[PDB]
C-alpha cells in the first residue's frame, strides 16, 4: 500500500515486496512504474508524448491535490529530500519499520528479502571478511552489477558463494573464457535452451575470467535486466534476483564503467581462527604452529622458489593433517615441501619442520608394498579401497615406492597433483599405480596440441551426399553425352568448393522441372531439389574432461609445462558433481595453475646402483 511512499527511498527491497504482491493506483502507478523497461498500457499519458498531451494531461492527487502532469517537479524534489535524509546504520531499521503492514526479511550486512530458502552456509568468518561483507552488503542491496578485485587467494569466489548461501540463491558460476561462443550465453541453431539465458529466465549468477567482444553480448543485460535473444526475438524480463556478479583483479573492461567495482581485503593471520573454525578437532594451535611452519618455509624460500605458500596451501596442509588426525605428523608437512628439486633443500625443509616439531626422526625421512586383496592398497601409511579390480611390471624400487605412496596420499585426499621430471615415466608410474590400485580409466589427455577448447568443450557432410544424389538424378533425367560438361562441372565444383555447386543443383532442378516410372522420379527430382535448397540455405561436441567427470576416469593431463592459457581447466579444478575423480596431471620441467595443484616432484627412479637390477629382473 502506501509504503511505496518510501518506494525508491531505500533500495528495491520495497520493490521486491511489491513483486510478492502489488497492484496499481493513480499516483502509485504514476510512481513505481517508471522503471527502465516495461510497457505501460494503464496510464500511457506519461510515455505517449511530451506535447500538450503529456504536457497538459493531468495528475491525480499529487500531494493529495490534483495538479497536471508536471507534478513530477512536485515530486522530484520531494523524493530528493528523502534521498538526502537517508544519508543519516539504522537505515534498515527504518526500512523494517517501514514494512509495518512479516515476509522473509533477511538481515545480513544490511538487509535483504529473497524469499526462496536458506542454504548450507559453510564459509563463515568474523574478520576482514566481515568488513568485506560490509563492503558488499550495500550494492547487493542496491542490485547494481558488482565486481571484486582484491589480491589473489582471498576466497572471493568463496566469499560470493557463501554470500549467496546467506541468500536463497544458487550461484551458477560460468567461467567465461576467450574461446566462448554465444551458446552458454544463449544457445544456437543450425533454437537452443541456453545457460545464461536460463539463469536470466529462472533468475543470482556469477562469472569469472572476465578480464581476459562477447562482453558486449552481456552488455545488454548490464544496461537493463534483459537480453538480445536474436533468433526467438524476445528480450527477457529478469524479474527475480538476477544479480550478475563477476570476478577479476584488474580494471580494463566496460564493466569498469558499467559495474560498481569494489575492493576486498583479507588479514591472512585470521586463517588461524578460520581452520580452527573449520576443523573442529584441530582446536590445538599445532595448527597455528603449522602456520608458523609455513612462515618458516617462506623464510627458507626467502634453490629457486617456484612455489608460494598460501592460505590455500595452508588450508590444504590443514586438509592433509585432518586426514592424518583420524589416527606423528612430521611426515605430513614432510610431504608439504616435497616440491623441492634439491634433496638438500628437502632436508632443510625437514630441519625447519623438526624445529617446529619435536626431536629428530630422520628414520621417517628415508622410510612397504601393499595389502592387496579387497581394499586392495595399503602402501605407506595410506590405504585405498580400490574398486572393480582388473590387475604388468609391478612394485619397482624404493624410489617407486615413495612416489607411489605420495600419489596414494594425494589420491586419498581428492586434491590435484602433478610430477615434473625428465623421463616421461611419471605417467608410467601414474598408470602403474592406477591399475595397481584398481585402474579407473587412464584418460591420458596429452594437453599440448589441442590447445584449450578440445579438452574442455565443443562441414561437408551433406555435400558429398547431395553430389551422389544429383549425379544419380542427372543420370536418370539427362543423358551421358548430353549433360556431359554439366556433369563435369557438377564434379569439379564438388571437390570441396561446396557453394557454387548450389547453382549446379538449382539450374539442374530448373531443367528437371522443365522435363515435366515417371511421377516417382518426378518426386525424386523434386525432393532432391528441395533438399538442395535447404542445404543452399544452410551453406550460407563432448569434452574429454567432461566425459571423465561424468564417467570416472583418471584425468592424466600430461605436458602442462608446454600448453597455452587453457585456465578454464584450472577453473574446472576450482569447481571441486563427482564421486571419485583423478586429476593426476603430469608436468615435465604458470603462476596460478601451478600454484593450485599439490605437486610432488619425481626423483628419477633409476639411481640406487642396484635398483636397476630390480627393473632389469622384471624386464629380463
Amino acid at each position: 500500500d502506501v509504503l511505496i511512499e518510501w518506494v525508491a527511498i531505500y533500495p528495491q527491497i520495497y520493490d521486491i515486496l511489491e513483486h510478492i504482491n502489488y497492484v496499481p493506483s493513480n499516483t502509485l502507478q504514476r510512481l513505481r512504474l517508471h522503471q527502465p523497461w516495461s510497457k505501460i498500457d494503464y496510464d500511457v499519458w506519461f510515455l505517449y508524448a511530451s506535447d500538450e498531451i503529456r504536457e497538459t494531461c493531468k495528475v491525480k492527487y499529487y500531494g493529495e491535490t490534483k495538479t497536471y502532469g508536471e507534478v513530477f517537479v512536485l515530486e522530484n524534489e520531494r523524493i530528493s529530500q528523502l534521498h538526502r535524509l537517508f544519508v543519516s546504520e539504522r537505515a534498515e531499521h527504518l526500512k523494517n519499520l517501514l514494512f509495518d503492514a512479516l515476509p522473509l526479511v533477511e538481515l545480513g550486512g544490511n538487509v535483504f528479502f529473497n524469499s526462496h530458502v536458506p542454504l548450507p552456509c559453510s564459509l563463515v568468518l568474523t574478520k576482514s571478511t566481515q568488513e568485506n561483507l560490509n563492503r558488499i552488503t550495500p550494492y547487493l542491496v542496491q542490485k547494481r552489477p558488482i565486481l571484486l578485485a582484491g589480491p589473489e587467494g582471498i576466497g572471493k569466489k568463496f566469499l560470493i558463494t557463501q554470500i549467496a548461501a546467506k541468500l536463497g540463491q544458487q550461484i551458477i558460476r560460468i567461467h567465461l573464457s576467450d574461446s566462448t561462443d554465444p551458446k552458454m550465453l544463449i544457445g544456437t541453431y543450425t533454437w537452443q535452451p541456453g545457460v545464461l539465458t536460463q539463469a536470466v529466465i529462472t533468475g543470482w549468477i556469477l562469472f569469472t575470467n572476465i578480464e581476459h567482444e562477447v562482453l558486449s553480448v552481456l552488455l545488454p543485460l548490464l544496461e537493463k535486466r534483459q537480453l538480445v535473444i536474436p533468433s526467438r526475438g524476445e528480450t527477457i524480463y529478469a524479474k527475480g534476483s538476477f544479480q550478475m556478479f563477476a570476478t577479476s583483479s584488474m580494471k580494463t573492461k566496460i564493466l569498469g564503467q558499467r559495474l560498481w567495482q569494489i575492493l576486498d581485503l583479507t588479514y591472512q593471520p585470521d586463517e588461524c581462527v578460520e581452520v580452527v573454525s573449520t576443523l573442529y578437532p584441530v582446536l590445538s594451535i599445532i595448527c597455528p604452529t603449522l602456520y608458523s611452519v609455513y612462515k618458516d618455509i617462506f623464510d627458507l624460500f626467502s634453490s629457486k622458489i617456484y612455489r608460494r605458500l598460501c592460505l590455500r596451501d595452508f588450508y590444504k596442509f590443514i586438509k592433509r593433517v585432518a586426514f592424518l588426525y583420524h589416527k606423528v605428523f612430521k611426515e605430513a608437512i614432510d610431504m608439504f615441501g616435497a616440491f623441492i628439486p634439491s634433496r638438500d633443500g628437502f632436508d632443510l625443509v625437514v630441519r625447519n619442520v623438526a624445529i617446529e616439531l619435536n626431536i629428530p626422526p630422520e628414520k621417517a625421512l628415508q622410510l612397504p608394498v601393499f595389502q592387496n586383496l579387497e581394499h586392495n592398497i595399503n602402501i605407506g601409511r595410506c590405504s585405498l579401497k580400490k574398486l572393480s579390480t582388473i590387475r604388468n611390471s609391478y612394485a619397482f624400487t624404493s624410489s617407486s615406492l615413495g612416489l607411489l605412496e605420495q600419489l596414494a596420499a594425494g589420491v586419498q585426499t581428492n586434491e590435484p597433483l602433478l610430477l615434473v621430471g625428465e623421463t616421461g615415466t611419471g605417467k608410467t608410474t601414474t598408470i602403474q599405480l592406477l591399475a595397481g590400485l584398481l585402474g579407473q580409466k587412464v584418460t591420458v589427455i596429452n594437453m599440448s596440441q589441442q590447445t584449450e577448447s578440445s579438452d574442455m568443450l565443443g562441414s561437408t557432410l551433406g555435400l558429398p551426399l547431395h553430389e551422389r544424389f544429383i549425379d544419380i538424378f542427372e543420370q536418370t533425367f539427362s543423358s551421358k553425352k548430353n549433360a556431359k560438361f554439366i556433369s563435369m562441372a557438377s564434379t569439379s565444383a564438388r571437390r570441396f568448393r561446396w557453394k557454387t555447386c548450389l547453382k549446379i543443383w538449382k539450374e539442374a532442378c530448373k531443367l528437371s522441372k522443365t522435363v515435366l516410372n515417371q511421377v516417382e522420379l518426378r518426386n525424386q527430382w523434386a525432393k532432391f531439389e528441395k533438399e538442395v535448397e535447404d542445404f543452399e540455405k544452410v551453406l550460407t561436441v563432448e569434452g574429454a574432461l567432461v566425459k571423465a567427470v561424468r564417467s570416472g576416469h583418471w584425468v592424466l593431463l600430461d605436458e602442462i609445462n608446454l600448453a597455452s592459457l587453457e585456465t578454464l581447466e584450472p577453473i574446472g579444478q576450482l569447481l571441486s558433481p563427482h564421486k571419485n575423480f583423478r586429476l593426476f596431471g603430469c608436468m615435465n620441467p604458470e603462476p596460478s595453475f601451478r600454484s593450485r595443484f599439490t605437486e610432488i616432484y619425481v626423483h628419477s627412479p633409476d639411481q640406487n646402483l642396484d635398483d636397476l637390477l630390480s627393473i632389469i629382473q622384471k624386464y629380463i
Binding site: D41, V44, A49, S50, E55, G69, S80, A508
Partner: protein, 811 residues
C-alpha cells in the same frame, strides 16, 4: 609530398636533359593516354574518390557502355563466364559486346576469379582453363578499380596503372561554383583556402588521429552556409579533441579568416513544439524512449553540434573517448525528439549479413500489436471490453492463444486502421500450423526509428564499407527474390548515429572521410555537476524532458539563485527568465516578493513596442518562430551585435531604464531632510529642490513609457542621469554644484531635457564628480550580476551583456 611535383620537374629536368572540371580533365587526359595501349586500366589513386573519374568519362566517350562489375567475395568464375545450361552474364556480355567494364574491388576477390580475370586480360580472344576453354567485341577495354590497399603481383603487373590525383584549389573553387548561390564568394574562397591550409599545416606538426580534412568537408561547409562565419568553425573544429590543438586551430582561423573565435555560448531553450540550443532547433514532435538521464548542461556545447548534425541528415558520429558520456548524448537528443533509439553493438566481429521460428514471428506480432494499440490509444483515447485484455495478452510454439487475439481483432475506422496491419498479420498467423523455412538496420531503415551503432570502433572495415554504400538514400539488399534490388528509400527519420571510443582502433579513413566527426570531453560545470550528481541534493536545474516542469524548475532555481541595490537585480532577473517563464513566475505568485509588483508592471509595460522593435529588429535577421529565449537571444546574435547595430543590446538596457525609472518614480511619489523640507514646501520656506526633483522625475517617467522613446547607446547616457538623480536624492548648500552636474548630463530630442531645462532654470531663478563613483559602482555590480546570471544561462563566464558592459567599463 608536393616536392615530388618539384622532383617531377627534376624528373622533367632529366627529361629535358634527354631533350567535367580542370584537374579532372587532367586525370581524364591521363586515362586517355592510358587507353592507347591494349591492357586493363587500373586507378592507382588515393582514397575518397571512387570511380566517378571513370564513371563520367564514358558519357564523353563514343557510346561506351559502363559495365560496373562490382567484383566481390561471393563471386564465382561461373558468375563471370556463365553459359552452363543443361541441354535437352555481365562480364560475358562485356566479352561479347564491347564496353567499358568497370571492375570494382579487385582486392576483395577470390583468388581463382582473380585467375579468371588474369586469363581474360589478354589482347587476343581468351582461352580460359578454369571453366571452359575460351570466351572470345574487339575493343572491350576493361577498367580496374585499384581499391584501398593485396592484389597479386602478376595481376597487378599485366594491367596498366593510372595515378588518379587529387583536386586543385582553383579547381576546388570551380567545384564550389555549383554551391555559390547562397555564398559570399570571397567567403567561399576563404573557406576553401582555410580547409586547404588547415590540412597542409596539420600534416606538419604534433596536432591524435590521421586528420583527413578533405574536400567533402569543404563542400559540406559550403552547403551548410546556405541555411542561415561561426557555425562553420563550430562544426569544423569541434572535432579537434586535444584542447591545445583547438587553440592552435582557432589561431589558424584568425590567420586565415581574420576574426576572433570567441565561443558562442549556447543555451537550452526547451519549449513544447521545439527544443533548441544555439543556432540550432529541433522538431520536437509520439515519444518512445521515456528516458532516465538528465540535460547535462556542460554537454550543451556539443549536444548542439550533433543536433545540427541530426537535422542536416549528415552521418552522426559521436566519436571520442570512453566514459565521457556519449550514449547519453544521443539518448537525450533522440529522447527529447522521441526518435525511438535502438542500438547495435557492432564490435563483436559482426558481419555484413548481421546488419542487412513460428514463435519469433508470433512474438514480433504481439509486440507490434502492442505498439499499434499504443499509438491508437494516444490520439482517440476511448477504447477499453476485452480489448484491454487483448492488450494484456499482447504483452504476455504453443501460440494458439494468439488466435484468440485475432478474435479480438475480429470484434470503426480507427479500428479499421489498426486492423489493416493487425487482421492481415493475424490472417497470415492462421498459418501457425504450417511449413517453415527458418534485418538489423533494415528494420530501422524501413521504419522510422533512430539507429545507434554503439561501441563501433572495431568490428570490420568491410561492414562499415557496406554501411557507407548506404551512407550516401537507396539500399541494395540481397534478401530479395531474383533480379531486383528494391532499395528502401524511407530514410526520413532514419539516422546512422555511430558511437566510437579511442581505446580501440579508430574508425577507418573512409567512414571518417564520409561523416560528421564530433568529439566529446569532460568539463563538469557548476549547475551541471549540481544536477548530474543530484541524487543527494534536492534539485536539478532542468529536471525533466517536459517543458511545463522545466519552467517551474528553473524558475524555482534562479529566483532562488539571487543571493540602491535591487535595480539591476530585478532588471537582469526579469531579463533572463523566459517570456513563458515570465507568465509562469506571475502564475507562481525578500526581493522576489517585490518582483510580483515588477511582474504586474511588466505585463503592463515590459516590452509594449519594445517587443515591436524586437520583432522588426529580430525579423530582418534570420530568427526563430516564437518567443522562447531572451538573454539567449541577446547572446544569440553574437556576431550580429558584434556588427555594432546593438538592436538586441539596446532593448536590454531599455529594460533597465524602465525598471530604474519605476524605482525613481515611486521614490518621487514618495516625495509627493532638506529635500523633505522642499517637498513639504510644495504645500524652511520657498522650495527650489522639490520642483528640481519632481520635474526631472517626470522627465524620467516620460523617458520610460513614445515612438522615439523606442528609438532612443544613448540610453546609457540617460541612465547616467538616472544614477545621478539617485545620487542627488542621496546627496540631498551644494545645490548649485549638483544643479551644474544635472546640467552636464543634460548637456550630455526635445522634451526629456526640456523638463530638466525648466526645473533647472527655476532652481537657478532661486539661485564633486562623485556621480562617476556610484556610476562605476553600478556598472561593476551589474557586471557581477551579469556573470551570475550568465551562469544560469549557459555556464561560461562571458556574455554579450558582459562584453558590452566591459567596453562600457572602458569609459
Amino acid at each position: 609530398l608536393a616536392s615530388l611535383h618539384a622532383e617531377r620537374q627534376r624528373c622533367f629536368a632529366k627529361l629535358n636533359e634527354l631533350a567535367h572540371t580542370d584537374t579532372t580533365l587532367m586525370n581524364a587526359s591521363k586515362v586517355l593516354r592510358a587507353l592507347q595501349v591494349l591492357k586493363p586500366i587500373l586507378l592507382e589513386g588515393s582514397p575518397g574518390v571512387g570511380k566517378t573519374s571513370l564513371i563520367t568519362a564514358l558519357a564523353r566517350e563514343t557510346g561506351h557502355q559502363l559495365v560496373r562489375i562490382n567484383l566481390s567475395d561471393q563471386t564465382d568464375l561461373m558468375d563471370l563466364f556463365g553459359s552452363d545450361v543443361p541441354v535437352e552474364a555481365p562480364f560475358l556480355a562485356a566479352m561479347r559486346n564491347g564496353h567499358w567494364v568497370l571492375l570494382d574491388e579487385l582486392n576483395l576477390a577470390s583468388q581463382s576469379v582473380l585467375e579468371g580475370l588474369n586469363a581474360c586480360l589478354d589482347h587476343r580472344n581468351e582461352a580460359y582453363i578454369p571453366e571452359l576453354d575460351k570466351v572470345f567485341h574487339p575493343n572491350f577495354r576493361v577498367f580496374a578499380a585499384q581499391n584501398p590497399q593485396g592484389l597479386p603481383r602478376s595481376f597487378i603487373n599485366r594491367f596498366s596503372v593510372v595515378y588518379v590525383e587529387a583536386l586543385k584549389e582553383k579547381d576546388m573553387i570551380e567545384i564550389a561554383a555549383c554551391n555559390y548561390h547562397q555564398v559570399n564568394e570571397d567567403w567561399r574562397l576563404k573557406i576553401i583556402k582555410f580547409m586547404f591550409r588547415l590540412q597542409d599545416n596539420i600534416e606538419k606538426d604534433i596536432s591524435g588521429s590521421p586528420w583527413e580534412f578533405n574536400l567533402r568537408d569543404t563542400l559540406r561547409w559550403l552547403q551548410l552556409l546556405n541555411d542561415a562565419a561561426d557555425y562553420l568553425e563550430v562544426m569544423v573544429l569541434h572535432r579537434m579533441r586535444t584542447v591545445e590543438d583547438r587553440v592552435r586551430t582557432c589561431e589558424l582561423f584568425k590567420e586565415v579568416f581574420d576574426i576572433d573565435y570567441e565561443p558562442r555560448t549556447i543555451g537550452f531553450s526547451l519549449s513544447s513544439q521545439c527544443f533548441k540550443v544555439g543556432h540550432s532547433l529541433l522538431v520536437r514532435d509520439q515519444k518512445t524512449l521515456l528516458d532516465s538521464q538528465n540535460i547535462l548542461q556542460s554537454q550543451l556545447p556539443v549536444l548542439e553540434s550533433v543536433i545540427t548534425c541530426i537535422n542536416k541528415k549528415w552521418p552522426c558520429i559521436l566519436v571520442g573517448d570512453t566514459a565521457t558520456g556519449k550514449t547519453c548524448i544521443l539518448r537525450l537528443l533522440a529522447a527529447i525528439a522521441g526518435a525511438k533509439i535502438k542500438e547495435m553493438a557492432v564490435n563483436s566481429d559482426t558481419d555484413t549479413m548481421d546488419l542487412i521460428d513460428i514463435s519469433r514471428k508470433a512474438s514480433e506480432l504481439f509486440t507490434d500489436l502492442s505498439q499499434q494499440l499504443l499509438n491508437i490509444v494516444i490520439k482517440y483515447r476511448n477504447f477499453d471490453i476485452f480489448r484491454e485484455t487483448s492488450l494484456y495478452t499482447l504483452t504476455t510454439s504453443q501460440a494458439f492463444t494468439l488466435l484468440q487475439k485475432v478474435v479480438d481483432q475480429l470484434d470503426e475506422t480507427l479500428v479499421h486502421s489498426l486492423g489493416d496491419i493487425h487482421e492481415k498479420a493475424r490472417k497470415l498467423l492462421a498459418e501457425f500450423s504450417a511449413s517453415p523455412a527458418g534485418g538489423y538496420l533494415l528494420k530501422a531503415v524501413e521504419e522510422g526509428h533512430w539507429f545507434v551503432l554503439d561501441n563501433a570502433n572495431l568490428c570490420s572495415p568491410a561492414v562499415l564499407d557496406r554501411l557507407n554504400s548506404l551512407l550516401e538514400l537507396i539500399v541494395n539488399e540481397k534478401t530479395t527474390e531474383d533480379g531486383h534490388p528494391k532499395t528502401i528509400k524511407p530514410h526520413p527519420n532514419f539516422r546512422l548515429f555511430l558511437t566510437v571510443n579511442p581505446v580501440y582502433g579508430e574508425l577507418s579513413r573512409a567512414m571518417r572521410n564520409r561523416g560528421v566527426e564530433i568529439f566529446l570531453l569532460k568539463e563538469a560545470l557548476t549547475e551541471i555537476d549540481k544536477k548530474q550528481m543530484s541524487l543527494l541534493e534536492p534539485a536539478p536545474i532542468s529536471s525533466a524532458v517536459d517543458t511545463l516542469a522545466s519552467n517551474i524548475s528553473y524558475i524555482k532555481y534562479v529566483f532562488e539563485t539571487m543571493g540602491n541595490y535591487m535595480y539591476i537585480a530585478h532588471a537582469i532577473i526579469l531579463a533572463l527568465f523566459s517570456p513563458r517563464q515570465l507568465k509562469l513566475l506571475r502564475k507562481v505568485l525578500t526581493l522576489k516578493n517585490l518582483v510580483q509588483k515588477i511582474y504586474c508592471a511588466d505585463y503592463f509595460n515590459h516590452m509594449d513596442l519594445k517587443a515591436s522593435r524586437f520583432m522588426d529588429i529580430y525579423e530582418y535577421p534570420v530568427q526563430l518562430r516564437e518567443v522562447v529565449g531572451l538573454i539567449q537571444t541577446i547572446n544569440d546574435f553574437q556576431s550580429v551585435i558584434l556588427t555594432s547595430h546593438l538592436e538586441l543590446p539596446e532593448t536590454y538596457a531599455s529594460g533597465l531604464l524602465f525598471v530604474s525609472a519605476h524605482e525613481i518614480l515611486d521614490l518621487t511619489e514618495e516625495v509627493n531632510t532638506y529635500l523633505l523640507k522642499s517637498a513639504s514646501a510644495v504645500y524652511g520656506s520657498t522650495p527650489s529642490l522639490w520642483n528640481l526633483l519632481n520635474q526631472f522625475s517626470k522627465f524620467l517617467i516620460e523617458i520610460a513609457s513614445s515612438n522615439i522613446v523606442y528609438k532612443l547607446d544613448v540610453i546609457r547616457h540617460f541612465l547616467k542621469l538616472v544614477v545621478l538623480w539617485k545620487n542627488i536624492y542621496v546627496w540631498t548648500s551644494r545645490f548649485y554644484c549638483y544643479t551644474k552636474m544635472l546640467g552636464e548630463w543634460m548637456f550630455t530630442k526635445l522634451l526629456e531635457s526640456f523638463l530638466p531645462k525648466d526645473s533647472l532654470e527655476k532652481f537657478s531663478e532661486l539661485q564633486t564628480v562623485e556621480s562617476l563613483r556610484h556610476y562605476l559602482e553600478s556598472l561593476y555590480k551589474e557586471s557581477q550580476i551579469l556573470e551570475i546570471a550568465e551562469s544560469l544561462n549557459s555556464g561560461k563566464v562571458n556574455s554579450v551583456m558582459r562584453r558590452l558592459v566591459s567596453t562600457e567599463i572602458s569609459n
